[PDB]
Amino acid sequence: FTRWFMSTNHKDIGVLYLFTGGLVGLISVAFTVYMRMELMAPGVQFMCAEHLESGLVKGFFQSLWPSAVENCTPNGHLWNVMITGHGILMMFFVVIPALFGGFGNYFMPLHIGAPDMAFPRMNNLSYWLYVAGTSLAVASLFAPGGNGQLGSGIGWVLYPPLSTSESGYSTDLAIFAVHLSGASSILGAINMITTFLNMRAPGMTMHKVPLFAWSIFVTAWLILLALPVLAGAITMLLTDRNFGTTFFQPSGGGDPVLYQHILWFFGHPEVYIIVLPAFGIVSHVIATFAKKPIFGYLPMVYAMVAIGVLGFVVWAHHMYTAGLSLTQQSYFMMATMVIAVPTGIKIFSWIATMWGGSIELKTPMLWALGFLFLFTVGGVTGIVLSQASVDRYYHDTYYVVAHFHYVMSLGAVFGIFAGIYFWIGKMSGRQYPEWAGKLHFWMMFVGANLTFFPQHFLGRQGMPRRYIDYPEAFATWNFVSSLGAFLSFASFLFFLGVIFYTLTRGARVTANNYWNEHADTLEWTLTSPPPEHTF
């Protein structure tokens, strides 16, 4: 019934975040399938302007079948709308709502022994702002936008003057969507911090709180500083578009580069807001299936604090080519390199936890091991990009695209899958079939690597970001990348089958702790699922 959506219990809200983030994730991933259909071969075959002259639903189905080049007038605006929609949905309405709003709302109170969050009614409102923001983002795709078409083709970061001069009001809907998303994240952050400090169980000191609840705690602080800054930046876009201000228009004395400073001041913290809850899940998962407590619990907590603090003083590594002086280029390059030290402490500690254990290679452990390997690959290419002298070549190329998909789609997303297989039995009372979770992992591992590793080659060859079409020489590795994306998509549909099977007819969970004794946190001392009233 509709009692799912009006609940204020932190367990039901976390489930609503998880399911909603999953469906929005399916929509955004479907966008990437269409994107990789067009990038599979040089020349434009799918995004033809001729499809505009047909019906909204008729032209959609025509868009999915290839036309010959001589019958396909390239429509770059649709490409720009697709990649903008794909990026906006992922960064604001998928991974953070799933890790923070989902697993954070469900398990952080359980991990600290709290019965609920400090403000359950506020926690229910945060979910509805997320759903409201998601609706406005989707509606912008069908609203009058740039070039007399629908949708905003301005990139997920909304650089002006392009974003401030895009015709229509689709861009205004996109800004309102990001406003609602940030409000949802801020309300959630307020609830994590107040519950973490005021509602811990007697005897649970801060040096006894498990690492996942710490990761949610640090993430909630980053949200409170980063997302008001972004709200100002995107509000200055709204007033330049609608209220005659000239914050970013040079004719009225403005500076477009000023926006990039304000947006990237949020833009990099947002990136550590994504991955920190995934760090905490990896700690719990690896300690469970290595049958050994986590190595260096206190350095693990500090390293996340060090990562969260440094993530606020490195933002200009997104602006090496935007006209920054040699001195600022030098500082931000050196400040960015420092982040590798606390991150490496966590990576080596995770291997130290495995060292000398009794490792079971069940599905949640597979995701965590893939995380270690694949997040390291993405993290070291970020260090490459931190060198402004080398970023001169790589900036706005697919090498950057390869970098951030290895840390997000092959890292943070691997933490999401790790948490789902680790906790679906606890959340639902039903267990997933082990053979299918393993086949999902290997399909995703092979497909996602085939998708994104060749983009290193394309970037080194100079393929720019946000291109509907590319010179013929880029054809080979674009073809491989598209094949990997199709295999990856098959693995995600298979995963949805696995989730549907698990929830409807999966093996009934009977034990409070169906894993082993080294899952030593409070949720494993409760039933599966936990009762409707905790503590």
Binding site: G43, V44, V69, E70, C72, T73, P74, N80, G146, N147, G153, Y159, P161, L162, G254, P256, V257, A290, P293, F295, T321, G323, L326, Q329, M333, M334, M337, A340, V341, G344, I345, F348, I351, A352, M354, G356, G357, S358, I359, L372, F373, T376, V380, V384, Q387, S389, V390, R392, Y393, H395, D396, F457, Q461, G462, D469, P471, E472, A473, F474, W477
Partner: protein, 256 residues
């Protein structure tokens, strides 16, 4: 002229270098590449060995250690040493890139939707450069028999489509070229991978880059900041020629 600055089929490395700055980029990248490949191989071998050596069915009783300060301090100082080594070789390269020398040739480049405007202030020469196949040349940003013939007539082939422009920026070989970049409407980005240069074309600001081409040939770039519907359709062609052929090109533009 030899077509040098361009992607090649199945390529996995950098585009060919034609400037000392690009050469520094290739070397610094290869230096950083061998160490980050060593770090990842080191991490991967550790994970695969630990899974093999400490699998449940081979080590049934897990250890319980949580501390090891000498190891923990070793894996903290060694990355710091590695990063300092990178910055030691990287900061001089970046200083060489951003410190603008005295110009032998000066070009002022302006980004438009969707084309580039070139101006030589010392020569009072100015022209616009459109993709062969753009509406300006009669096309609609796609390959066609008319576009292929235009590519051949301009000295290119069908393979250079999306890179070749109707006009080119011509410079003399082995001369210091300083380029001043700005945008006229939205932000664009001017780049030539073979030169190791890239500078955003921001409206209201005039930024500078420099290159010295070490050999003659044709070198391509593509607009590298999303600027609207034809972002993928406003490339850059730079022709590096002899000092004599450069003057010949200059004289062909002089009005009597």
């Amino acid at each position: 002229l030899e077509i040098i600055g361009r992607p090649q089929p199945g390529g996995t490395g950098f585009q060919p270098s034609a400037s000392p700055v690009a050469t520094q980029i290739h070397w610094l990248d290869g230096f950083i590449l061998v160490i980050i490949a060593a770090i990842t191989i080191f991490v991967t071998l550790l994970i695969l060995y630990a899974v093999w050596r400490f699998h449940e069915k081979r080590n049934k009783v897990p250890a319980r250690f949580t501390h090891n300060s000498p190891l923990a301090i070793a894996w903290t100082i060694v990355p710091i040493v590695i990063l300092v080594a990178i910055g030691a070789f990287s900061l001089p390269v970046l200083f060489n890139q951003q410190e603008i020398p005295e110009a032998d040739v000066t070009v002022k480049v302006t980004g438009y939707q969707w084309y580039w405007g070139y101006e030589y202030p010392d020569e009072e020469i100015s022209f616009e450069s459109y993709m062969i196949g753009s509406p300006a040349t009669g096309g609609d940003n796609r390959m066609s028999p008319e576009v292929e013939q235009q590519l051949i007539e301009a000295g290119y082939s069908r393979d250079e489509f999306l890179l070749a422009t109707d006009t080119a920026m011509v410079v003399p070989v082995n001369k210091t070229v300083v380029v001043q970049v700005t945008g006229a409407d939205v932000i664009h980005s001017w780049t030539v991978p073979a030169f190791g240069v890239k500078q955003d074309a921001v409206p209201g600001r005039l930024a500078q880059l420099w290159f010295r081409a070490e050999r003659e040939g044709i070198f391509f770039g593509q607009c590298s900041e999303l600027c609207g519907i034809s972002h993928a359709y406003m490339p850059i062609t730079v022709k590096v020629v002899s000092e004599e052929a450069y003057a010949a090109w200059l004289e062909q533009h002089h009005h009597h």
